[PDB]
Design an enzyme around this catalytic site. Structure first.
Site, mmCIF file in Angstrom:
data_model
loop_
_atom_site.group_PDB
_atom_site.id
_atom_site.type_symbol
_atom_site.label_atom_id
_atom_site.label_comp_id
_atom_site.label_asym_id
_atom_site.label_seq_id
_atom_site.Cartn_x
_atom_site.Cartn_y
_atom_site.Cartn_z
ATOM 1 N N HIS B 42 0.805 -1.243 0.000
ATOM 2 C CA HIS B 42 0.000 0.000 0.000
ATOM 3 C C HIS B 42 0.837 1.292 0.000
ATOM 4 O O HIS B 42 0.338 2.375 -0.333
ATOM 5 C CB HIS B 42 -1.055 0.016 1.121
ATOM 6 C CG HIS B 42 -0.548 0.506 2.445
ATOM 7 N ND1 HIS B 42 -0.237 -0.342 3.486
ATOM 8 C CD2 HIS B 42 -0.325 1.759 2.904
ATOM 9 C CE1 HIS B 42 0.172 0.371 4.523
ATOM 10 N NE2 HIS B 42 0.123 1.648 4.197
ATOM 11 N N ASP B 88 -0.611 -7.321 1.923
ATOM 12 C CA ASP B 88 0.015 -6.002 1.951
ATOM 13 C C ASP B 88 1.528 -6.176 2.065
ATOM 14 O O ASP B 88 2.103 -5.993 3.143
ATOM 15 C CB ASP B 88 -0.517 -5.161 3.119
ATOM 16 C CG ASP B 88 -0.132 -3.692 3.012
ATOM 17 O OD1 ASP B 88 0.408 -3.271 1.956
ATOM 18 O OD2 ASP B 88 -0.375 -2.948 3.984
ATOM 19 N N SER B 185 4.102 2.830 8.284
ATOM 20 C CA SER B 185 3.666 1.798 7.329
ATOM 21 C C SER B 185 4.818 1.275 6.474
ATOM 22 O O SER B 185 5.620 2.055 5.985
ATOM 23 C CB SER B 185 2.589 2.344 6.375
ATOM 24 O OG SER B 185 1.312 2.411 6.998
ATOM 25 N N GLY B 186 4.871 -0.040 6.285
ATOM 26 C CA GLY B 186 5.900 -0.662 5.462
ATOM 27 C C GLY B 186 7.148 -0.991 6.264
ATOM 28 O O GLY B 186 7.996 -1.771 5.810
HETATM 29 C C1 LIG Z 1 -10.256 -0.219 4.915
HETATM 30 N N1 LIG Z 1 -9.394 -1.423 4.850
HETATM 31 C C2 LIG Z 1 -8.509 -1.261 3.683
HETATM 32 C C3 LIG Z 1 -8.537 -1.559 6.053
HETATM 33 C C4 LIG Z 1 -9.260 -2.060 7.322
HETATM 34 C C5 LIG Z 1 -9.513 -0.772 8.132
HETATM 35 C C6 LIG Z 1 -8.396 0.155 7.708
HETATM 36 C C7 LIG Z 1 -7.919 1.298 8.325
HETATM 37 C C8 LIG Z 1 -6.866 2.017 7.769
HETATM 38 N N2 LIG Z 1 -6.422 3.165 8.439
HETATM 39 C C9 LIG Z 1 -7.369 4.179 8.925
HETATM 40 C C10 LIG Z 1 -6.459 5.359 9.302
HETATM 41 C C11 LIG Z 1 -5.098 4.695 9.606
HETATM 42 N N3 LIG Z 1 -3.963 5.550 9.263
HETATM 43 S S1 LIG Z 1 -2.715 5.825 10.249
HETATM 44 O O1 LIG Z 1 -1.865 6.576 9.399
HETATM 45 O O2 LIG Z 1 -3.173 6.358 11.485
HETATM 46 C C12 LIG Z 1 -1.938 4.273 10.610
HETATM 47 C C13 LIG Z 1 -1.295 3.584 9.576
HETATM 48 C C14 LIG Z 1 -0.709 2.371 9.810
HETATM 49 C C15 LIG Z 1 -0.734 1.820 11.109
HETATM 50 C C16 LIG Z 1 -0.137 0.575 11.380
HETATM 51 C C17 LIG Z 1 -0.182 0.065 12.641
HETATM 52 CL CL1 LIG Z 1 0.577 -1.480 12.908
HETATM 53 C C18 LIG Z 1 -0.817 0.734 13.684
HETATM 54 C C19 LIG Z 1 -1.416 1.947 13.464
HETATM 55 C C20 LIG Z 1 -1.390 2.514 12.170
HETATM 56 C C21 LIG Z 1 -1.999 3.765 11.882
HETATM 57 C C22 LIG Z 1 -5.139 3.445 8.757
HETATM 58 O O3 LIG Z 1 -4.183 2.772 8.436
HETATM 59 C C23 LIG Z 1 -6.287 1.578 6.575
HETATM 60 C C24 LIG Z 1 -6.766 0.430 5.962
HETATM 61 C C25 LIG Z 1 -7.833 -0.288 6.522
#
Ligand SMILES: CN(C)[C@@H]1CCc2cc(N3CC[C@H](NS(=O)(=O)c4ccc5cc(Cl)ccc5c4)C3=O)ccc21
Ligand SMILES: [Ca+2]
Ligand SMILES: [Mg+2]
Lengths: 52, 234
Positions: B42, B88, B185-186
């Site tokens: 992603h 992913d 992420s990643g």
């Molecule tokens: C919809 N579907 C594809 C799936 C299932 C629900 C979901 C939520 C999110 N979100 C929602 C916002 C969040 N973004 S973030 O930048 O705060 C973030 C990004 C990666 C993370 C990774 C971990 Cl391990 C923990 C917290 C994390 C937080 C984030 O990653 C992305 C994909 C998906």
């Protein structure tokens, strides 16, 4: 707890149960020591080791 | 990374940072070898052109160990879905090899059975990155690490508003204010075994950062070890 289930079969890294006995092995960049358990880095900067 | 501590000199040498045109990090990666970086599929949509930086711990100073590498090939898992974030995972082949040194070294790839039985049953893993330090904050200028407990698979499915596939696992805390966050992420999720660190996950997604009743969702590297091996051979 037997073989690999008991303290990783005394292996430094990978443990396999073959013919009801423990077989140890190592990640790429490591060589199995003469005792067949320890893993020795083959060259500088082996994987998985913090530097210095 | 929310909570946790700064990675100190030499402590997180397998960390890679995907950088955009502005030389700003947007995602993490894990150094697998002199030529290959592991990352999340992603992350590959968040910048049209990106490079990989290694050996960095402070984005505000030149410490002499930093190295930028151009990407030669992007190997995204063909079954990756934006809908669920299933599969992913991506591997990057660099144009020039990484020269290992202080703060620059690979994490080990484990074997599947042993990792599932012995690494993933340990109490905790370690996640690291330059991501946000609070849900609404800015990206960290310092590389951070955080010890994250492995979470019972049933508890994780129960906590999640979305599907946790066989290619995902959960780690972190129920209420404690510690978790990966935006920009992590990643990046690497590694598990220590007898002072050696093995790659066990890829920072994937979360319903916010460090939220109550929510955990961090990671790509389950052990399900992709053959795929990784194949990607690294071509
Ligand atoms: C919809 N579907 C594809 C799936 C299932 C629900 C979901 C939520 C999110 N979100 C929602 C916002 C969040 N973004 S973030 O930048 O705060 C973030 C990004 C990666 C993370 C990774 C971990 Cl391990 C923990 C917290 C994390 C937080 C984030 O990653 C992305 C994909 C998906
Ligand atoms: Ca720097
Ligand atoms: Mg939580």
């Amino acid at each position: 707890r037997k073989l690999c289930s008991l303290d990783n079969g005394d292996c430094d890294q990978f443990c396999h149960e073959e013919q009801n006995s423990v077989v140890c092995s190592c990640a790429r960049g490591y060589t199995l020591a003469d005792n067949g358990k320890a893993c020795i880095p083959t060259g500088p900067y082996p994987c998985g080791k913090q530097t210095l | 990374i929310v909570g946790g501590q700064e990675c100190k000199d030499g402590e997180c040498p397998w960390q890679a940072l995907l950088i955009n045109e502005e030389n700003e990090g947007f995602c993490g990666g894990t150094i697998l070898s002199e030529f290959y970086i592991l990352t999340a599929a992603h992350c590959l949509y968040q910048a049209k052109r990106f490079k990989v930086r290694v050996g960095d711990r402070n984005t505000e100073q030149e410490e002499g160990g930093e190295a930028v590498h151009e990407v030669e090939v992007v190997i995204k898992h063909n079954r990756f879905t934006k809908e669920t974030y299933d599969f992913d995972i991506a591997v990057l082949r660099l144009k020039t090899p990484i020269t290992f040194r202080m703060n620059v070294a690979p994490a080990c790839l484990p074997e599947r059975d042993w990792a599932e039985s012995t690494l993933m049953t340990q109490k905790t893993g370690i996640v690291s990155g330059f991501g946000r330090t609070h849900e609404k904050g800015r990206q960290s200028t310092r590389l951070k690490m955080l010890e994250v407990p492995y979470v019972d698979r049933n508890s994780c499915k129960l906590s999640s508003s979305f599907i946790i596939t066989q290619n995902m696992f959960c780690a972190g805390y129920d209420t404690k204010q510690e978790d990966a966050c935006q920009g992590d992420s990643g990046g690497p999720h590694v598990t220590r075994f007898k002072d050696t660190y093995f790659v066990t996950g890829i920072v994937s997604w979360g319903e916010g950062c460090a939220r109550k009743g929510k955990y961090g969702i990671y790509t389950k590297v052990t399900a992709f070890l053959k795929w990784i091996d194949r990607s690294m051979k071509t």
